Amino acid sequence: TTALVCDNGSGLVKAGFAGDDAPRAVFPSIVGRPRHQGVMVGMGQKDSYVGDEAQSKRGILTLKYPIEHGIITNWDDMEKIWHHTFYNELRVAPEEHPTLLTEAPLNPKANREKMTQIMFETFNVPAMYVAIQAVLSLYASGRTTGIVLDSGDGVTHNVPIYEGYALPHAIMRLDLAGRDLTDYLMKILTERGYSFVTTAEREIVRDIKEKLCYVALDFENEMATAASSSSLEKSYELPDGQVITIGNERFRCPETLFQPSFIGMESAGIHETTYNSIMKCDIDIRKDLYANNVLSGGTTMYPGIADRMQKEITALAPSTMKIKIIAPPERKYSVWIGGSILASLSTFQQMWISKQEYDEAGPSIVHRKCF
Amino acid sequence: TTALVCDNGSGLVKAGFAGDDAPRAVFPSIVGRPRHQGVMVGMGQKDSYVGDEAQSKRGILTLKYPIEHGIITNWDDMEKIWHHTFYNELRVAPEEHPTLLTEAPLNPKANREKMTQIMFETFNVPAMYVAIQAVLSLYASGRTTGIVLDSGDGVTHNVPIYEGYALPHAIMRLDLAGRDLTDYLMKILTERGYSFVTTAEREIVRDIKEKLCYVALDFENEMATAASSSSLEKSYELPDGQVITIGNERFRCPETLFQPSFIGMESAGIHETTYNSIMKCDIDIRKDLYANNVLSGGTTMYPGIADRMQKEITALAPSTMKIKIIAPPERKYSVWIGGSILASLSTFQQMWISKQEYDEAGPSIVHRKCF
Amino acid sequence: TTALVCDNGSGLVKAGFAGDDAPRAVFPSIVGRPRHQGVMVGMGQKDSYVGDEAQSKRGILTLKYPIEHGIITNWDDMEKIWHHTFYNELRVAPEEHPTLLTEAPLNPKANREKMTQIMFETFNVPAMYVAIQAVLSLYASGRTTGIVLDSGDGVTHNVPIYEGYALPHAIMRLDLAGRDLTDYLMKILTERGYSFVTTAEREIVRDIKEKLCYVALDFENEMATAASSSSLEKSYELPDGQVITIGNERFRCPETLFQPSFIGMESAGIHETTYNSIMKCDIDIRKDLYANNVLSGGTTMYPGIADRMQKEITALAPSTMKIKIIAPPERKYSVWIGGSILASLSTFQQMWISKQEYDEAGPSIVHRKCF
Amino acid sequence: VPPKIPDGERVDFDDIHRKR
């Protein structure tokens, strides 16, 4: 009997059986309803397109993400996505397989309670367990200490763990992630002539960001160079022709992560939030966290982030301590790989929430010592 | 057939086989339970880290000394420490070896009774004996006369002995010791900005005290010198960088030994209690005690204590008598050396408390002539 | 010539003429700089709004407290605060009045020295005197003895005083105060969905804490009740609407004072540190300190804290002796009342720090007998 | 209570090497 490790996240759903190397099914987490009229009758027209189909027929659909910032805001779309994931992407009945969901830290409790209630009443799974999204990322590296910054697509959270003991009072969460970077890129692309407004084109802007953006090592000199020379201006092809040429917008959109004053947010960049979460920890385990910093999440896949982070942390941290930034090549699937490893352990077999316990205590069972 | 010379102490448990010159294992007497939550599974993390293993994980533990001032306040912790010492640090079964423990003078008798009862009931040792902590140090030096000042870590006592005869009526005990010096150093180090509150940082302050603090020959003169010159400015590297600068605080910590009014004590200093004890004994052996003054305990390893103490005693003593201070370099292990010597003596082979004697008279046999 | 009894504190500056009952000028100590662009011309927009002005325009400012925990971190901002207090809010020249500054106990002496230097160099006050924040609070009560626990907004310090004699060896200081309670309230309010990140919304959180949070008589009973009933949920209105309902967070926020294990601090609660300080005192003055416990400071204004404190102390203390908590209703302004009373005494008129003495001896005269 | 990890034995950091 294998275990199902689903990882909803916010933007990409990754699912696959426990004990594998890569998730078997990965697809964007969007539900797209049509908005036009429709004149041909009997064309097999559906009432809602979910999964990766909705970004293939995205011309006449209005894609609407069901998760804004970690929290789930539209439960009907989430139920649609879970149903499509179980029955059509893996074709496995949910009533004969345990489930391992992942939840961002410092989420509202109602989210977890409703997730448990839906998973136990609608899909009728035998037993499901919810885990913090960064602990599995740390599991993936094979270590037992370190501070992991899982800058996902919806929310960016920085969790330090030492010798398997997490520090709840030093968890730093910031709501700047890939979605706000995409929105800022779409806003600054109007400075050159191209205007994207409808939700269908936000996917195009997202693809442009994924394909062209890069994080500068130093910002001032690069900005000075890009405004004088012409070696950074790169071209891209839109899905109807009409090639565009992006200049200094390549490294200015990802710069927001290290300087959130662009979007008016109050907090500091991710290079200072990590140091602040480190300094909140006790004085004895700062050296080990300095030497064992770990990166994760899709949005940390930008070419040129591991060196900028190293330079900024070296600037902030004391000079004598050695600073190492772990960046595995498989950063995108690190959380799911950790979940697959966790679901295969023998000692984990008694941590699941038995359906009997839910029937006895209700959906609030998740908040108990049974996490 | 070999004898075990154990030294409980308070802070540094030292143990080893009899007849040697160095103890086998010297490790801190600390038992530290975890304090945080703990998220990673399968680490096999124990619920109690003791001894030297616990001083490597101080970040996620609450180190706690089971001995406040000589006496034992948590018998469960002391049982854990004894089990760890006998079974793991020596790899010697306790069932076929005698035991020689040490006790500070003028302590409650219930402590010795409970110690012997636990040693004979749980461990089932063949025979055990409790010896005075200072008489062993005096025996170790190869002499038989004089007054020994044993500035340990929990209790500081003065024991005068003449030609193998002790004087129970002239024993002066004060509870000022290295622990109070560490606390006072921590209290005064906040005047510059460096604040230590966590029980784990106490060990950092203790290491600072061991590596930096020293006894000034003249207190007021040195303090005036430090206010104008800058040769006392000493730098130290914290376990995470951010070096600190200690000025005149380095010789205020051991100045408490001579002026206990710093920590609120109404009693006199160490050089004065010894003088009072010497003047309390017979008038016929005062010169011999002057000629055989020997220091004991690790705390007497401060740089320059034997010179200021000699000067103070010479000033207080009559000008005719000659004052000499015997300061062996290995004063830290002197008690264990004395125990090793005593365990090897053939004349001492019949002073042990046999198992039959305990089964016949109970734990109260300790208070008898057989200590 | 009257004296200005100023009280910088940390978070709430109180000042006024000596001899009155309440300060004439009370305002939060915040220095606020603009962070947005600003396009309109001729509006008279200054570059730094301090005091109560920054509490009206906090939407477009970045408020920054200049006093973290007793210590001063921005000397120019503190200079601006003092300048606003003297020239703008009281309209009195500093050269024609003496001044009484307030300082928390066990603080770095560099802060006090630099405060005196700033006071005598910039404002050129004829004479200034620094007083401990607990002695003044004790004076305001009209008695002469007792143990005062003055938990302000920066530090929680407990000082026992007997017959006008302080005990420097029995002062216990904790860094847990109103600011950390506000941060913990911010961290626990994300469990329902309301997330506050910007430093301006921390003022809303502080207002909620002032208006709704209360200390439970018993933590476990109230926690169990709040999970079943709904009689504790109170509603609050944010400055734009969006009414929010608080359930059991009302008494979880101030419980951190008695259980610092929530925010990860190692030290014990405020109920046990005072008892430990009392036990540090001599055996002949413990009953009187039991009978005259005095509370003050803003953080002790939670409704129902005097009952929990008394119950905890009675549980810890020996049964026979009496424990009486003195909780004056106007305990918020206690330090200012004490300063006003002390500055009006004829005996104190000769204890000022004369300008010529500082001129001929430097700022370091404060640490001397004139302290 | 937080998720109290049940008492097992081991292991980690061999899986990463195996995977690589």
Ligand SMILES: Nc1ncnc2c1ncn2[C@@H]1O[C@H](COP(=O)(O)OP(=O)(O)O)[C@@H](O)[C@H]1O
């Ligand atoms: N190769 C890449 N380069 C830059 N950004 C990327 C890349 N791949 C993904 N991203 C960004 O990361 C997001 C996906 O993050 P992901 O880790 O899937 O989030 P989640 O934690 O919800 O799974 C995408 O929205 C995209 O903006």
Ligand SMILES: Nc1ncnc2c1ncn2[C@@H]1O[C@H](COP(=O)(O)OP(=O)(O)O)[C@@H](O)[C@H]1O
């Ligand atoms: N080299 C040193 N310099 C100064 N102080 C020391 C030194 N070594 C140990 N100490 C102090 O002495 C204590 C150890 O004393 P020790 O003799 O082990 O006590 P016990 O009598 O309990 O064995 C330590 O806590 C430390 O504070």
Ligand SMILES: Nc1ncnc2c1ncn2[C@@H]1O[C@H](COP(=O)(O)OP(=O)(O)O)[C@@H](O)[C@H]1O
């Ligand atoms: N009525 C109240 N109820 C609860 N808490 C309060 C109340 N008034 C003030 N506080 C808390 O006390 C703090 C003010 O403390 P205060 O005594 O002014 O500090 P200081 O010693 O620096 O003057 C505020 O930050 C607030 O958090």
Ligand SMILES: [Mg+2]
């Ligand atoms: Mg993720």
Ligand SMILES: [Mg+2]
């Ligand atoms: Mg000793």
Ligand SMILES: [Mg+2]
């Ligand atoms: Mg105050």
